[PDB]
Design a protein around this ligand. Structure first.
Ligand SMILES: CCCCCCCCCCCCCCCCCC(=O)OC[C@H](CO[C@@H]1O[C@H](CO[C@H]2O[C@H](CO)[C@H](O)[C@H](O)[C@H]2O)[C@H](O)[C@H](O)[C@H]1O)OC(=O)CCCCCCCCCCCCCCCCC
Ligand code: CLA
Ligand code: CLA
Ligand code: CLA
Ligand code: CLA
Ligand code: CLA
Ligand code: CLA
Ligand SMILES: CC1=C(/C=C/C(C)=C/C=C/C(C)=C\C=C/C=C(C)/C=C/C=C(C)/C=C/C2=C(C)CCCC2(C)C)C(C)(C)CCC1
Ligand SMILES: CC1=C(/C=C/C(C)=C/C=C/C(C)=C\C=C\C=C(C)\C=C\C=C(C)\C=C\C2=C(C)CCCC2(C)C)C(C)(C)CCC1
Ligand SMILES: CC1=C(/C=C/C(C)=C\C=C\C(C)=C/C=C\C=C(C)/C=C/C=C(C)/C=C/C2=C(C)CCCC2(C)C)C(C)(C)CCC1
Ligand SMILES: CC1=C(/C=C/C(C)=C\C=C\C(C)=C\C=C\C=C(C)\C=C/C=C(C)/C=C/C2=C(C)CCCC2(C)C)C(C)(C)CCC1
Ligand code: SF4
Ligand code: SF4
Ligand code: SF4
Lengths: 728, 150, 85, 61, 105, 80, 182
């Protein structure tokens, strides 16, 4: 009868809470009034479209302003000594010298420097003028409108799909593997061959003439002939200059390895062959599940067949087909887990093997990106583990999964939790113990007494990969190894050359300071997983509260009685888990930032010597590289690092409000409000105004979220200001 | 040598870390007479600090480009760095743990056990203390016998 | 170099004649055990309808030759490279 | 029911003493459902040393 | 404050290593540690901790090493007291190491 | 309002009625238990959900449960 | 006679099996479904590796060939004579040949009919006495072939040449001058 339209219960709430929950309840379909599986799936589908339309519009927006407000064309001509423009600024709040200050580049007013690496992205892909950016902006905007269209389209009763269709998993897998993965990477490879490669060779190929231009001299003869080697006949020379004819070859598909020496990025020929190769594996593999032809696998049959003899895995995977196909949260958990891993995967491979020409020369961009994807990966992981327990509560069928791997999982969960506890306490005690030991020796002027363990195991791996520093002589280090002799005339010359250039990021040199920090990160991993896993497995029931599953995923507590039950819900478990996310990726991003900062600065001996103790982090990382940042203004004058320092403090202030909502809880605030609501009602003149919605204190769960949110935002923004301002 | 790092017995930086620390204390010792109290301390520290460096050079640890001794943690040039100590711990920790096990179980059957966690039966504990010397031989035999697990 | 007309026709025939006369008592019997369903209960029986002794549909052809050509193109392709161990 | 003072394992899964031992105080000879009154050495969270159980939620061992 | 007071003045505490004042650097870091350590107690609730303790207790019982005095998470009140206590001690001790190393050097 | 239920494990020791601040529960005759009486929740529209009732219950597990549900002016403890 | 004196042979190995000396400590054949499988694959491994050995002895036994240095030519070379091609041709006509004949095992130990023309399996009372000898010449070969691979990776040498090196300097040249144990 009032908004929340989707909840009678919340709509009848007389207070301001109705509002808050209404905002908070909006996307939870299963909890709305008179909901069905059909409406659930259909709303989810439409929502996916909605997301896509926002994404395409967002991307088009970037291209739009780079083309309209940027210096894209000044960059292409001189990428090394021009700062890429993101956007113009029109701020009526700025003072006279502010407008002078922010006018960087070739700009006719105040501008901001892009640290997204979209320049080098574009530029490496083939984008040459503002025109190209405009056309792409129009296109993707058109795709946005199309997606919006499509959302409302399959909302009508004629175009409403049936639940059976949504449950056709085999078909979606076949199509996504073959088409979405296979075809689209094949088509990209098409783009690299037809546009990117020629663009790097200095021949501008556009919509109007591609069809008329030969990418290879004897094109499409090798292809059908099976003389594929001709496509790798003459690669670009070692003196090739990117985007110019000088030193350019004709090959379209190679396995060279290493980098394009002047740009220091992967070879677009290697990238072409890569996308093409995977494309084939995807296309062949995408014909694996049974649909409407009779040929193909059964998922159910595969899963149910995989039960080992002598019941060492119980009933194996029997019943998982149904509990997965039914459970949406399960699918989102698997998806988020995989997506989180690959997000960090991307982050860790991109920095050490950059793919873009004249990236990695851009320090700030690289730092910004690598922080970006690791934090995104962290949040995504916590979320994976957050729809973990939502499954465990709402979705699991105890009878239908009897004695399976899943039920057996629940069975020995105390073992799992307790052994994670062991693994985290071990690390926590020893690593901290060895650091603080290292500090005390530093303090007393005896650094020779430090406990510095050399990372022999990683140093071994680097040796097996062909770095020769450590002199183990294994695999790709040793010249008398089959592994060496096999591919020595393939790509190893490009590889080995790149691994041993220590001015690049590829498999950096490692010492005892590396050793400690990785075990700090391991502490990060294991503990966060302890919170999340514990929260997932005890979502259903515990000894304190056996009937927890009757309440659901978020609840304040179960009262003060029998000891006290604050932060008992799996919700709260995930909440607690976010703090470790934050702390852990905080450590990882620092690790990253410094070990590069000292590389770029030209003194890696700063890192190796101060990373072995924590004051070293405090003094040589934090205290040193904020010098310029905090100076952005002083009583004497100003410079260009105004916004970062403003935002630095902004983040800190957000960070401390969070503490407010986290530490102080409801009873104080409500009674505060209780006196205020009397105060209003017997204040004359003001008497004549009264509220419609009774003023009430935010909930516990509300307080829980609002703290967390402020904390995270402050975290991110503060670092971002630091990272960028210092690296720049 | 191992991971290409130099031995402390030879390395230059390590031998220049000797010099700096010693030549910090000899810039202090000037400001005092030779008969005085603190001069006997700034001489004794030096003697100890100069002895300390000598005793890693004789130990033969690997010192890096840093000048600091790094450690080796797997196999046999540098056993004593970790591989021997490691057992030291697992023993004395296993000692403590198994004594604590034999105490709690030895109390368990005595009407109210909780009193013995607070007003600890010292002459029980000090007998279990010595018994806990031969613990791995008991710990193994108990894993065999099958009284170790619930 | 070998000729491109003998190996593709040879490898395709070497996997079609393999599929025609060996792998059927292995293929058709976990084709009947496997029964695709989702939480309870259209297959084009017109494309499968074949006037054959043992019943070889249009998909079996485009599946068993796919080995043959993934063989044929793999054979010809690597004959091009000079990979010396 | 069980004999008074006998050592009995609990088999009610939602109990604080589940799979744990207790002693029988008195089995009420009436039409009551949970007649077997058990007392334990260790309390639960709610400061309680004693509870009532049915005949299928005890096993004398 | 951020720059001219905090940042500039913390100079002598942050390089106090290798001197007579190094104890103040150690206490500088230790006081941050203990301050931050309080936040675990302040931000959380004993519901989590008690279940954690359930699993650990399992592990003990498995090896016949369970205590008679039944291991219980701190009360909500004690959680708050420990929190505020470590918060104050950390904060105050950090300012303490700061000033004294600063003003002495 | 909040939901309050009493399960059959009730002994009828009456602590949960005697503890309530808003008089939601009452004692009724029954035939199940040694005390010949069981707890009941006929007035849950006045239930605040403060969970004294639960804290007061001696049974294992508790034989009163309060499920915090749709919230109304009374359940939110308002005097304004 | 069981594999370790004293020890009791498990419940699952009936000794009406050929060559059961009661060896399954890891209890891999506990389940009879999984046992019937291994009784089969044992015999096949047995059979191949018996040819495998017999073959890669005969190579270097009378001619200056060697089983490690045989594939060198990737022109093949049987008994000193030339050959009928190359790589692709052998793969294809080995794939089909094997894939067909192993494909048609709709798994048996003693299929007979074709495979026993000369007619030994026959006379029940001695049929078992061969199947022992089958699996024991089977095992002894599977061990020997591993023995042929193990010694190759240590040295260069080659079975009959290693045997000849050991006969010259037995005390000197043996397996404590390589690295299985240092
Ligand atoms: C955009 C800017 C933000 C604008 C608006 C949001 C700000 C206000 C949010 C605070 C309100 C939270 C809240 O309502 O508080 C309570 C809510 C809802 O609780 C629910 O409260 C319900 C209330 O019940 C009532 O309502 C029900 C129907 O709704 C029924 O009628 C029911 O019978 C009736 O009792 C039930 O009790 C449910 O059991 C209970 O789950 O808690 C929740 O679930 C929270 C809602 C789910 C959130 C999803 C997880 C978010 C995790 C984020 C992690 C940080 C991410 C940061 C990234 C930063 C990157 C840069
Ligand atoms: C969806 C992505 C996106 C984003 C994040 C932004 C963000 C911005 N745009 Mg917008 N803009 C976008 C797409 C986007 N734009 C597109 C696709 C178009 C149409 C081609 C425009 C056309 C546009 C104009 C005409 C102007 C802005 C301006 C701005 C700025 C002020 C906000 C505003 O006017 O609204 C801000 C930086 C204003 C600005 O630059 O100041 C301004 O005048 N934008
Ligand atoms: C979906 C992507 C895509 C599309 C639409 C095209 C389209 C085309 N390609 Mg191809 N091409 C692609 C991907 C793509 N290519 C990829 C991934 C590669 C790398 C193997 C190539 C490598 C390639 C070559 C080497 C040649 C073509 C050529 C052609 C043209 C003739 C094809 C024919 O008749 O057969 C046609 C316009 C021919 C041409 O004339 O251009 C030609 O010589 N393409
Ligand atoms: C600097 C602050 C700080 C410190 C020193 C610790 C220390 C610890 N926490 Mg953590 N923790 C913190 C803040 C902190 N926590 C915060 C702010 C929260 C959010 C409320 C948590 C939530 C938390 C959980 C949920 C768990 C730990 C656990 C642990 C232990 C991990 C094992 C180890 O390293 O030893 C350890 C005692 C784990 C444990 O006890 O095992 C565990 O499960 N902590
Ligand atoms: C007699 C003394 C005794 C013994 C033998 C054990 C034995 C054990 N404890 Mg420990 N534990 C003890 C006292 C003892 N505990 C005390 C006094 C406390 C409170 C400070 C703890 C708190 C504790 C925790 C929090 C954990 C262990 C764990 C463990 C197990 C792994 C080793 C470890 O991390 O420690 C192990 C079975 C870990 C486990 O269960 O694995 C684990 O997570 N213990
Ligand atoms: C000394 C070695 C040896 C011994 C004693 C046997 C003994 C036996 N083999 Mg033969 N077999 C051997 C080596 C040996 N095999 C080798 C090396 C192979 C691999 C080529 C085979 C492959 C083989 C097959 C495929 C078959 C036999 C069969 C048999 C059985 C009946 C025919 C016969 O006596 O021969 C008999 C138990 C036949 C059978 O069981 O009938 C049968 O089908 N064997
Ligand atoms: C099946 C029986 C068998 C027999 C009779 C032999 C006989 C022989 N082996 Mg042995 N060998 C066998 C199995 C067998 N091997 C197995 C199962 C293994 C795996 C551990 C090895 C691994 C092995 C190595 C690693 C070496 C020999 C070598 C030798 C020769 C010297 C003895 C020695 O050092 O060992 C000798 C002719 C040595 C050689 O070639 O000199 C040598 O280096 N063998
Ligand atoms: C009737 C008859 C006959 C005949 C028959 C025939 C003539 C057949 C044929 C058949 C065939 C003739 C077939 C073919 C083919 C197939 C398939 C199925 C294919 C496939 C392919 C593929 C799969 C491809 C792939 C790829 C791509 C596309 C891309 C890149 C490259 C690659 C390679 C990867 C005879 C006389 C004998 C006998 C009697 C009867
Ligand atoms: C050698 C070495 C190493 C390595 C190591 C490793 C790899 C390990 C593993 C390990 C493992 C894998 C383990 C496992 C375990 C298991 C278990 C299962 C356990 C158990 C335990 C128990 C049962 C205990 C008991 C007791 C006692 C005995 C006494 C005290 C008390 C108690 C009760 C605690 C390194 C390189 C590092 C270093 C150098 C040396
Ligand atoms: C675009 C283009 C191009 C290119 C292309 C490429 C580079 C690729 C393609 C590709 C494709 C397009 C495809 C591929 C593949 C496919 C497939 C389709 C396969 C399949 C397979 C299967 C189906 C099999 C099955 C089976 C059976 C049935 C039986 C037994 C088992 C197995 C599994 C064997 C060119 C330049 C020419 C021209 C222009 C356009
Ligand atoms: C990321 C990016 C972007 C976007 C992109 C996109 C979203 C795209 C899409 C799409 C596209 C741009 C596509 C295209 C396509 C094309 C085609 C597709 C063509 C074709 C042609 C032809 C002539 C062919 C034919 C044929 C044959 C011959 C045989 C077989 C069949 C067929 C039909 C295939 C932008 C720049 C804005 C920004 C930066 C980055
Ligand atoms: S959360 Fe607030 S209310 Fe619920 S228990 Fe913990 S303290 Fe009492
Ligand atoms: S408290 Fe538990 S037991 Fe005592 S009356 Fe209320 S319900 Fe029945
Ligand atoms: S919750 Fe508080 S109010 Fe609602 S019933 Fe139980 S006791 Fe009476």
């Amino acid at each position: 009868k009032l908004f929340p339209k989707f909840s009678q219960g919340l709509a009848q709430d007389p207070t301001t809470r109705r509002i808050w929950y209404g905002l908070a309840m909006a996307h939870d379909f299963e909890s709305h009034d008179g909901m069905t599986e059909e409406n659930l799936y259909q709303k989810i589908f439409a929502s996916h479209f909605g997301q896509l339309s926002i994404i395409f519009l967002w991307t088009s927006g970037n291209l739009f302003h780079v083309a309209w407000q940027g210096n894209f064309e000044q960059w292409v001509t001189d990428p090394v000594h021009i700062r890429p423009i993101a956007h113009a600024i029109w701020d009526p709040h700025f003072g006279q010298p502010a407008v002078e200050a922010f006018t960087r580049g070739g700009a006719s007013g105040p501008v901001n420097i892009s640290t997204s690496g979209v320049y080098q992205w574009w530029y490496t892909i083939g984008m040459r003028t503002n025109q190209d950016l405009y056309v792409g902006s129009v296109f993707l905007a058109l795709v946005s409108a199309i997606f919006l269209f499509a959302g409302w389209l399959h909302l009508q009763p004629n175009f409403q799909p049936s639940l059976s269709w949504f449950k056709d998993a085999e078909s979606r897998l076949n199509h996504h593997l073959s088409g979405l993965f296979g075809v689209s990477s094949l088509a990209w490879t098409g783009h690299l061959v037809h546009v990117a490669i020629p663009e790097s060779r200095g021949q501008h190929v556009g919509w109007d003439n591609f069809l008329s231009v030969l990418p290879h001299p004897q094109g499409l003869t090798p292809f059908f002939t099976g003389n594929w080697a001709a496509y790798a006949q003459s690669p670009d020379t070692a003196s090739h200059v990117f985007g110019t004819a000088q030193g350019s070859g004709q090959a379209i598909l190679t396995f060279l390895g290493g980098f394009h020496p002047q740009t220091q990025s992967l070879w677009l020929t290697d990238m072409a062959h890569h996308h093409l190769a995977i494309a084939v594996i995807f296309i062949v593999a995408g014909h694996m599940y049974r649909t409407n032809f009779g040929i193909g696998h059964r998922m159910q049959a595969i899963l149910e067949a995989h039960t080992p003899p002598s019941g060492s895995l119980g009933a194996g995977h029997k019943g998982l087909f149904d509990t997965v196909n039914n459970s949406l949260h399960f699918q989102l958990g698997l998806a988020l887990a995989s997506v989180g891993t690959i997000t960090s995967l991307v982050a860790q491979h991109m920095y050490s093997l950059p793919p873009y020409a004249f990236q990695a020369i851009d320090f700030t961009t690289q730092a910004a990106l690598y922080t970006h994807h690791q934090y995104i990966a962290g949040f995504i992981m916590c979320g994976a583990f957050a729809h973990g327990a939502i499954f465990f509560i709402r979705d699991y069928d105890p009878e239908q999964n009897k004695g399976n791997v899943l039920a057996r999982m629940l069975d020995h969960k105390e073992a799992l939790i307790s052994h994670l506890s062991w693994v985290s306490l071990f690390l926590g005690f020893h690593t901290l113990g060895l650091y603080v030991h290292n500090d005390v020796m530093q303090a007393f002027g005896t650094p020779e007494k430090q406990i510095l363990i050399e990372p022999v195991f990683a140093q071994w791996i680097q040796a097996a990969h062909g770095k020769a520093l450590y002199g183990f002589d294994f695999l790709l280090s040793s010249k008398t190894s089959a592994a060496f002799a096999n591919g020595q005339s393939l790509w190893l010359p490009g590889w080995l050359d790149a691994i041993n250039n220590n001015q690049n990021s590829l498999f950096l040199t490692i010492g005892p300071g590396d050793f400690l920090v990785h075990h700090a990160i391991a502490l990060g991993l294991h503990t966060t997983t302890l919170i999340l896993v514990k929260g997932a497995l005890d979502a259903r029931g515990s000894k304190l509260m056996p009937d927890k599953k009757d309440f659901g995923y978020s609840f304040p507590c179960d009262g003060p009685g029998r000891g006290g039950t604050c932060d008992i819900s799996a919700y709260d478990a995930f909440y607690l888990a976010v703090f470790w996310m934050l702390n852990t990726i905080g450590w990882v991003t620092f690790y990253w930032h410094w070990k590069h900062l000292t590389l770029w600065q030209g003194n890696v001996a700063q890192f190796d010597e101060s990373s072995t103790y924590l004051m070293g982090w405090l003094r040589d990382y934090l205290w040193l590289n904020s010098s310029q940042l905090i100076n952005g203004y002083n009583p004497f004058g100003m410079n260009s690092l105004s916004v970062w320092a403003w935002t630095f403090l902004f983040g800190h202030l957000i960070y401390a409000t969070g503490f407010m909502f986290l530490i102080s809880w409801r009873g104080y605030w409500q009674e505060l409000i209780e006196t205020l609501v009397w105060a209003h009602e017997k204040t004359p003149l003001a008497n004549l105004v009264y509220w419609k919605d009774k003023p009430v204190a935010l909930s516990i769960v509300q307080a829980r979220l609002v703290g967390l949110a402020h904390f995270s935002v402050g975290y991110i923004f503060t670092y971002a200001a630091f990272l960028i301002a210092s690296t720049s | 040598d191992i991971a290409g790092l130099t031995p402390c017995s030879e390395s230059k930086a390590y031998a220049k870390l000797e010099k700096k620390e010693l030549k910090t204390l000899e810039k202090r010792l000037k400001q005092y007479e030779a008969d005085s109290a603190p001069a006997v301390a700034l001489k004794a520290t030096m003697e100890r600090t100069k002895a300390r460096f000598a005793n890693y050079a004789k130990a033969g640890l690997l010192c890096g480009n840093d000048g600091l001794p790094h450690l080796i943690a797997d196999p046999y040039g540098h056993a004593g760095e970790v591989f021997i100590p490691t057992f030291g711990f697992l023993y004395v920790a296993g000692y403590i743990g198994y004594v604590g096990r034999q105490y709690l179980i030895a109390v368990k059957g005595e009407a109210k056990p909780t009193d013995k966690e607070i007003i600890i039966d010292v002459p029980l504990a000090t007998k279990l203390a010595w018994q806990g010397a031969g613990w791995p031989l008991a710990a193994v035999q108990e894993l065999q016998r099958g009284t170790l697990l619930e | 170099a070998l000729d491109p007309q003998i190996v593709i026709s040879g490898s395709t025939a070497a996997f079609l004649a393999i599929g025609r006369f060996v792998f059927l008592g292995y293929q058709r019997r976990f084709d009947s055990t496997v029964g695709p369903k989702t939480t309870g209960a259209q297959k084009n029986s017109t494309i499968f309808a074949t006037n054959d002794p043992a019943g070889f549909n249009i998909i079996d052809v485009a599946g068993w030759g796919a080995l043959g050509h993934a063989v044929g193109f793999a054979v010809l392709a690597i004959n091009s490279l000079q990979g010396a161990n | 029911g069980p004999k008074r003072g006998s050592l009995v394992k609990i088999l009610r899964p939602e109990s604080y003493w589940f799979n744990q031992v207790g002693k029988v105080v008195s089995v009420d000879q009436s039409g009551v459902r949970y007649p077997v009154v058990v007392r334990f050495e260790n309390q639960n969270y709610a400061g309680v040393t004693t509870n009532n159980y049915a005949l299928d939620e005890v096993v004398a061992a | 404050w951020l720059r001219d007071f905090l940042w500039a003045q913390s100079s002598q505490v942050i390089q106090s290593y290798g001197s007579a004042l190094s104890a103040y650097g150690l206490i500088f870091l230790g006081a941050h540690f203990v301050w931050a350590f309080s936040l675990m107690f302040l931000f959380s609730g004993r519901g989590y901790w008690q279940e954690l303790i359930e699993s650990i207790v399992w592990a003990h019982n498995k090896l016949k090493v369970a205590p008679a005095i039944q291991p219980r998470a701190l009360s909500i009140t004690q959680g708050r007291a420990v929190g505020v206590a470590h918060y104050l001690l950390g904060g105050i001790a950090t300012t303490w190491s700061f000033f004294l190393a600063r003003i002495i050097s | 309002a909040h939901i309050v239920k009493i399960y059959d494990t009730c002994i009828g020791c009456t602590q949960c009625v005697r503890a309530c601040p808003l008089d939601v529960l009452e004692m009724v005759p029954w035939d199940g238990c040694k005390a010949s009486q069981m707890a009941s929740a006929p007035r849950t529209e006045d239930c605040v959900g403060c969970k004294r009732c639960e804290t007061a219950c001696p049974t294992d597990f508790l034989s009163v449960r309060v499920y915090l549900g749709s919230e109304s002016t009374r359940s939110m403890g308002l005097s304004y | 006679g069981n594999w370790l004196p004293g020890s009791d042979a498990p419940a699952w190995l009936p000794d009406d099996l050929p060559g059961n000396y009661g060896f399954d400590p890891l209890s891999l054949g506990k389940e009879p479904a999984s046992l019937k499988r291994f009784t089969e694959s044992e015999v096949i491994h047995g059979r191949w590796a018996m040819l495998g050995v017999a073959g890669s002895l005969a190579v270097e036994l009378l001619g200056y060939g060697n089983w490690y240095d045989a594939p060198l030519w990737a022109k093949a070379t049987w008994f000193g004579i030339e050959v009928p091609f190359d790589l692709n041709a052998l793969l294809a006509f080995e794939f089909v040949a094997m894939a067909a004949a192993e494909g048609q095992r709709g798994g048996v130990v003693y299929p007979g009919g074709a495979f026993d023309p000369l007619g030994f399996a026959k006379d029940s009372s001695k049929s078992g006495e061969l199947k022992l000898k089958e699996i024991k010449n089977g095992r002894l070969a599977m061990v020997a072939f591993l023995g042929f691979v193990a010694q190759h990776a240590a040295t260069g040498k080659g079975p009959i040449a290693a045997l000849g090196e050991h006969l010259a300097n037995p005390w000197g040249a043996n397996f404590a001058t390589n690295g299985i144990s240092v």
